Amino acid sequence: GQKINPIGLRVGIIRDWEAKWYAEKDFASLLHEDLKIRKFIDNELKEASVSHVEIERAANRINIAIHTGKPGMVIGKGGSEIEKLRNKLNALTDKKVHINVIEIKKVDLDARLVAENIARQLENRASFRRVQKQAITRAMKLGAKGIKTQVSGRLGGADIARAEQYSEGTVPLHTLRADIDYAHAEADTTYGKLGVKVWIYRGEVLPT
Amino acid sequence: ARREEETKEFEERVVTINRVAKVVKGGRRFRFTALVVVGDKNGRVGFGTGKAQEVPEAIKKAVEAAKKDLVVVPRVEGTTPHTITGRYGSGSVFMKPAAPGTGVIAGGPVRAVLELAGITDILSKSLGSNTPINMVRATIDGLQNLKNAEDVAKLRGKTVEELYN
Amino acid sequence: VPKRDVLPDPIHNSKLVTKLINKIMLDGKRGTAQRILYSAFDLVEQRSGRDALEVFEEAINNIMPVLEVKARRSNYQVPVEVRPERRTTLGLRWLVNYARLRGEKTMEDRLANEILDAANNTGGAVKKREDTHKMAEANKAFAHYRW
RNA sequence: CUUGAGUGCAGAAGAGGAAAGUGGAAUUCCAUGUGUAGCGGUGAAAUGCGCAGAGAUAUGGAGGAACACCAGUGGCGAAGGCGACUUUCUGGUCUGUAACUGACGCUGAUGUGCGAAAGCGUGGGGAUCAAACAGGAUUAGAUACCCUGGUAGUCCACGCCGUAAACGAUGAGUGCUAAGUGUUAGGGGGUUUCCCGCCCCUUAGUGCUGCAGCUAACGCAUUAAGCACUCCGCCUGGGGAGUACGACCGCAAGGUUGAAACUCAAAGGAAUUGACGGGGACCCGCACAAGCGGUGGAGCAUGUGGUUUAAUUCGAAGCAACGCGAAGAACCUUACCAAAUCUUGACAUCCUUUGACAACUCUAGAGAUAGAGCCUUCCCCUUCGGGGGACAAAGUGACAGGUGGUGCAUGGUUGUCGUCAGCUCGUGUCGUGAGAUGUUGGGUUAAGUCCCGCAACGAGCGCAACCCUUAAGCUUAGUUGCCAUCAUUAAGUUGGGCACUCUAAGUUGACUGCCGGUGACAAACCGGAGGAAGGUGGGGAUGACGUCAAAUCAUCAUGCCCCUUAUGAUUUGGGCUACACACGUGCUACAAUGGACAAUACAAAGGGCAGCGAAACCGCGAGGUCAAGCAAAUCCCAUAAAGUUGUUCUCAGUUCGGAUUGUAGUCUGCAACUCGACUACAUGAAGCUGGAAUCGCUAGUAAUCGUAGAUCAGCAUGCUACGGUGAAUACGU
Ligand SMILES: [Mg+2]
């Protein structure tokens, strides 16, 4: 309790993992191989604002793909960048890779992108409300059945913390065939720290 | 409603806000509010109100109900025809016309009213209660029970210019 | 809310045995009660030669209340008929519970003494009958004009 | 002059008043007859009355007070008030009438008088009822409620006080303005043979619902709180205070008149929402009952408190902290303490400066460490430099670090109210408004579940499902699984087989869904069949808006604040585990369903690669040698135990129990001294079912037996799952 994330509930049925490889019971070498991948990507995230990266892993190789709204940041002009990133990766990965960018579609309706965005306007001291109303508003143009959008902490860089939410549309949550994009974020200006809890719902579909 | 028309010019104008509560066990659910008047300052004005969990919602809803109720407000010479006293729920009121060049003299709310119905020079003192609402309802009660020379001499068998203010 | 019966037991052929063994089964050892009871119906016939159903059925009539009380409200308490289910349940319940209270060292001597004395209208089972039927159906006057 | 007012004339009614008179029941007191042992009272009792015969029962006597039915939102009167009846005297009112006088009227200061009950005087009376009082009881106490008695007084007459929620908290009088509907005394008319019956109308008071309108709202509405006029009285924030001084009246208590000082920023009305009620209606729940078993006693383990301490490391504290974080405390961990030790530091990034990196011994030291030998050695790319992952010791400013405080500044995370069934938003309506409306009512459900009805229509979150698991079957596939047909065998071990079991994949099925009744035909309830499984089939996961300024800065992250040659650092040893005591959690006991010995059958689930430890051998034993198979349906963990059959025991602090202590040994780890675990011998504790209070649980449940794992050099009575045996009761709210 109290509530949970849907993703650890919907997983097992309607989402594969962000990470995939052979068990053999030796995980720790390979899972904490993945762990540094999970670290370094922040230095793409800061410019890219990516949703999620997969790691498929065949026997002798690695195959990943980063979900972005901004390809041009990471692809380089004509490929100037991803090779550089392979170079800075092999130095610690200590094994080959075929990093293969992926674009995510209806590109900016996504969750971690948009949660990150509203955090970004809270970084430069945007007032809280317009962020949320414009979030839901543009979301509703782009097509969706319902959205929730939340913030916590000391609003307006002010006294004891609060939390609100401006949801619209139906947000089927305690059901089990949803395929919703939950995320989370953080941001500091001067006082403590500010997180969020975005949500969406965009139609019912399985991975088979 | 009655008969909002969105066609004239408009100038919304705000009089107050409260923070107003309904206590349910545990917390205290409260709902900001506001009153509004809307007129063309050319011969039309009326109030409008509403409540919401947030201001812009409240004021906008108020304005949507605002246009829906109106009075014609017989005006003459950039001035009201004569003097009355309005009365509604102990929010009495008293107006009087004026030598021009004065400007409306009155309190905050009523000033926002008559300044929005395009009246220029007039004298008043609010009376009874100081509460903003029934003050206004006093005003428009009087303006609703108000007449000009054409409004009257029509009725009486005779006609103006043997009689005029 | 109904009863969910126990079927027969064909040792020795009857059903009250079936309802009996289960109460003696302290801590879920059904074979021990099975043994000592069945032997009790060997020995009760051995001493005082007769049938097991004579001593058993007759006793569990002799120790079997048919009128009884219950409290409610000051302190008043309705005299109340006993359902046949609870009738036998009380007979056997207080039967074993006092059959304990004899105080012998033997598995079955205590029982044969119990129901063969009960079948002679003696033993604390019969005294329990007489006490319950004493306070009951002696103060009936006040609590009887009710359900 | 007659329309206001008053007088008439003919009428109607009435608990209108004062005095006298009469009568029945009933209470009581006494007397008598009858007759015995209780009466009377309470929630339970007691005190009292009673064998001197009560009470109860019958007769008759006295005596005071009140008057059953009738009695009604009915009447009367100026109010207070007035209810048995009859007489005497006597006040006003309403109608009709209209001759009669012709404005004589309304209000009313100061004055004058009547005025509930209590109270007072003087005198009579004294049946009940009953302040004060006594006794009893309850109660911590009860001079209070309760009970038994019980005086003044209630009562009458003459006098006196002279007030009240004296209320409709609404001054008197006149006049105008929608209806409906009853009621009381009358009047006119039509119908009726006769109205006495029916109807229509009109006056006077009387009650209710209601518009116009008023009012802040509730509400009033021809009996105005409406529309107005006259006259009178009265108010100017609350406490101080109806107090004080003074006057006046009074037999007296006290009544009338009636301030101030100081002091407060409120006092207060009406209505909405929420909570609450020892207020009410309904339903549900291991909430009660019906039942079983336990804690509390006895000893042990574990944790908190305390005590004590160089330190006994911090947090958590009613449920909603106390076998929690801590799913592993010799060191390590460990934060705390003593000692020796350090300064870009234990450690991370940056610049220089280099360099691939290092190891084994000696010394000193407890280690930390250094003191010397020794050798780490430009490896990927070089054309003499260089570039590089990566080393380097030194400088080294930025720095680094803080288990350093604030969880009442925060993110994140989690409990709890509670899987309780509810909580909210839009549009529109009402309301001056806060708010209400929906979401209410009838019916219905485990469910704001659903139908119907309704100034409400819709949406969302929520329950349900949606998913995992479970109950049966069909297809598919057959090794390591199985062996039915057979052969063979220690043995399914192998030939052969995949029929069955099984293994995991796909699909069928259960949905008021089929029938019958009931029911607003509907929802839904009840029963019937079928099927393995009927009304969410069992279970799990899932936890609304929010609450407790709940918990965590010590998982982490972090604002602010603070430390810095130490609030940072390394190491050895130590403690986190103390011990007059209490508390809570749990274990084993207090023995014959029992104890000891021997034989003997039935599982499920999960783990094993530097780990499972098969066989055999030694040893009483923990264990030891030894090594086969084993990355697993293969082989090992791993006998399952309870049970079942047998022998013995025959009620003892016992062959009960199994604490504590000494000795002898096993393994792990360097080393088991604080402080590991384990076996063997000997010891042989308290304790013979648990007080006051108290917890768990409704069927595979409780009760009860053992197994596997995580954490793990060694160490779990605890935690999690796993199955085995397996019940009693559920009258009912
Ligand atoms: Mg009348």
Swiss-Prot record, chain A:
GO molecular function, one term: rRNA binding
Entries under Pfam families matching the protein: KH_2 (PF07650), Ribosomal_S3_C (PF00189)
Cellular compartments per GO CC: cytosolic small ribosomal subunit
SMART domains, sorted: KH (SM00322)
All copies of domain KH type-2, residue ranges: 37-105
Keyword terms, alphabetized: Ribonucleoprotein, Ribosomal protein, RNA-binding, rRNA-binding
Keyword Ribosomal protein attributed: yes
InterPro entries linked to this entry: KH_dom, KH_dom-like_a/b, KH_dom_type_2, KH_sf_prok-type, Ribosomal_S3_C_sf, Ribosomal_uS3_bac-typ, Ribosomal_uS3_C, Ribosomal_uS3_CS
Protein's UniProt keywords contain rRNA-binding: yes
Physiological role: Binds the lower part of the 30S subunit head. Binds mRNA in the 70S ribosome, positioning it for translation.
Subunit structure: Part of the 30S ribosomal subunit. Forms a tight complex with proteins S10 and S14.
UniProt family annotation: Belongs to the universal ribosomal protein uS3 family.
Annotated protein name in UniProt: Small ribosomal subunit protein uS3
Curated annotation (Swiss-Prot), chain B:
Signal peptide stretch: none
Cell division keyword on record: no
InterPro entries according to UniProt: Ribosomal_Su5_D2-typ_SF (IPR020568), Ribosomal_uS5 (IPR000851), Ribosomal_uS5_bac-type (IPR005712), Ribosomal_uS5_C (IPR005324), Ribosomal_uS5_N (IPR013810), Ribosomal_uS5_N_CS (IPR018192), Ribsml_uS5_D2-typ_fold_subgr (IPR014721)
GO molecular function: rRNA binding; structural constituent of ribosome
Statement: the UniProt record of this protein carries the keyword Translocase: no
GO cellular component, one term: cytosolic small ribosomal subunit
GO biological process terms held by the UniProt record: translation
Alphabetized Pfam families for the sequence: Ribosomal_S5, Ribosomal_S5_C
Keyword terms: Ribonucleoprotein, Ribosomal protein, RNA-binding, rRNA-binding
Domain S5 DRBM: 10-73
Protein family: Belongs to the universal ribosomal protein uS5 family.
Subunit structure: Part of the 30S ribosomal subunit. Contacts proteins S4 and S8.
Domain remark in the UniProt entry: The N-terminal domain interacts with the head of the 30S subunit; the C-terminal domain interacts with the body and contacts protein S4. The interaction surface between S4 and S5 is involved in control of translational fidelity.
Matching PANTHER family: MITOCHONDRIAL RIBOSOMAL PROTEIN S5
Function: With S4 and S12 plays an important role in translational accuracy. Located at the back of the 30S subunit body where it stabilizes the conformation of the head with respect to the body.
Protein name: Small ribosomal subunit protein uS5
Species, as recorded: Staphylococcus aureus (strain NCTC 8325 / PS 47)
Gene that encodes the chain: rpsE
From Swiss-Prot, chain C:
Record InterPro entries: Ribosomal_uS7 (IPR000235), Ribosomal_uS7_bac/org-type (IPR005717), Ribosomal_uS7_CS (IPR020606), Ribosomal_uS7_dom (IPR023798), Ribosomal_uS7_dom_sf (IPR036823)
This protein's record includes keyword Chaperone: no
One Pfam family matching this protein: Ribosomal_S7
SUPFAM superfamilies named among the record's database cross-references: Ribosomal protein S7 (SSF47973)
Alphabetical UniProt keywords: Ribonucleoprotein, Ribosomal protein, RNA-binding, rRNA-binding, tRNA-binding
Gene Ontology molecular function, alphabetical: mRNA binding; rRNA binding; structural constituent of ribosome; tRNA binding
GO annotation, biological process: ribosomal small subunit assembly; translation
Signal sequence segment: none
Gene3D superfamilies: Ribosomal protein S7 domain
One GO location term (cellular component): cytosolic small ribosomal subunit
Function: One of the primary rRNA binding proteins, it binds directly to 16S rRNA where it nucleates assembly of the head domain of the 30S subunit. Is located at the subunit interface close to the decoding center, probably blocks exit of the E-site tRNA.
Subunit field text: Part of the 30S ribosomal subunit. Contacts proteins S9 and S11.
NCBIfam families: rpsG_bact
Family as reported in the entry's similarity comment: Belongs to the universal ribosomal protein uS7 family.
Protein name: Small ribosomal subunit protein uS7
Lineage of the organism: Bacteria, Bacillati, Bacillota, Bacilli, Bacillales
Gene, per the UniProt record: rpsG
